[PDB]
């Protein structure tokens, strides 16, 4: 039995990645506007079937057919994740003063669950973070 500590998978169709600028830690609304902007860029630009591997420490995109890693991101590098219906947006890089982001857009009936799960990942890894080095 595999769990969030082990890593669990979900089927997704990789649409394409995009990039944008963001502030250190923008609001949830701007975050959603950024994710939204991502989808838009993807639509008005239009495939690969993949297995998303979510872990309390990694987010990997596997080529469903060949299981070869197309993307492998350390959980600390992802700032935001969002579900817009059947869509999933993975966003990779008070608060970190950085700007340029790399957005990965996927299409999945499991958008809600994937985002739920990666959200849980953020949860354990963050508590683990505080808990580890004092706070």
């Amino acid at each position: 039995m595999e769990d969030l500590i082990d890593g669990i998978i979900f089927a997704a169709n990789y649409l394409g990645s995009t990039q944008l600028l963001s502030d250190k830690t923008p609001s949830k609304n701007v975050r959603m506007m950024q994710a939204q902007e991502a989808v838009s860029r993807i639509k008005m630009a239009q495939m690969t079937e993949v297995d998303l591997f979510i872990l309390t420490q990694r987010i990997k995109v596997l080529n469903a057919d060949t299981q070869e890693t197309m993307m492998d991101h350390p959980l600390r590098t992802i700032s935001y994740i969002a579900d817009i219906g059947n869509i999933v947006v993975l966003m990779a890089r008070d608060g970190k003063r950085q700007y340029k982001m790399i957005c990965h857009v996927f299409e999945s009936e499991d958008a809600q669950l994937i985002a739920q799960s990666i959200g849980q990942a953020f949860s354990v890894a963050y508590q683990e973070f505080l808990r580890a080095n004092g706070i």
């Binding site: 830690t25 959603m32 590098t77 219906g85 890894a125 963050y126 973070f129």
Partner: peptide, 12 residues
């Protein structure tokens, strides 16, 4: 329409 911010990210 939901989003999740990675808190730990903030410190990196």
């Amino acid at each position: 329409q939901n989003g999740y911010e990675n808190p730990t990210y903030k410190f990196f």
